[PDB]
Amino acid sequence: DNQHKKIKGYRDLSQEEIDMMNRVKELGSQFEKLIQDVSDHLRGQYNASLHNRDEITRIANAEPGRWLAIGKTDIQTGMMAIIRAIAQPDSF
């Protein structure tokens, strides 16, 4: 379909550009694995700390699940910006 040629901003890309975009994506998958690992650590920390009210309150005050979510969003939009720097669409 060459669907991309139907989207505004399309630019033809070299293999080097594609490889660089794929590299950002592969590095991102390593961050995704790391984030899943941190999330499992947090789930365990909470489970172990059940019934310890002071530690449950400490975890709630630290808001680690929220901070992990912020980090995930920043990593992903950062990847998107690096890829746009490579792909260089001809649109605003």
Ligand X SMILES: Nc1ncnc2c1ncn2[C@@H]1O[C@H](CO)[C@@H](OP(=O)(O)O)[C@H]1O
Site map (CB under 6 A) of ligand X, residues 52-81, x = contact: -------------xx--xx--x--------
11 is in an annotated binding site: yes
Distance CA 61, CA 59 (A): 5
Q: Is 28 exposed, middle or buried (0-12, 13-18, 19+ CB in 10 A)?
A: middle
76 is in an annotated binding site: no
88 is in an annotated binding site: yes
Site membership for ligand X, residue 34 (CB under 6 A): no
Tokens 């680690």 found at: 64
Tokens representing residue 7 in the block: 């989207």
Between 15 and 51, name the residue whose CB sits nearer to a second copy. Answer: 15
Q: Which partner in a second copy, ligand X, none is near 44 (CB below 5 to 8 A by kind)?
A: none
Distance CA 8, CA 2 (A): 13
- The binding site consists of 3-4, 10-11, 25, 88
What is the contact surface with ligand X in residues (CB under 6 A)?
Answer: 65-66, 69-70, 73
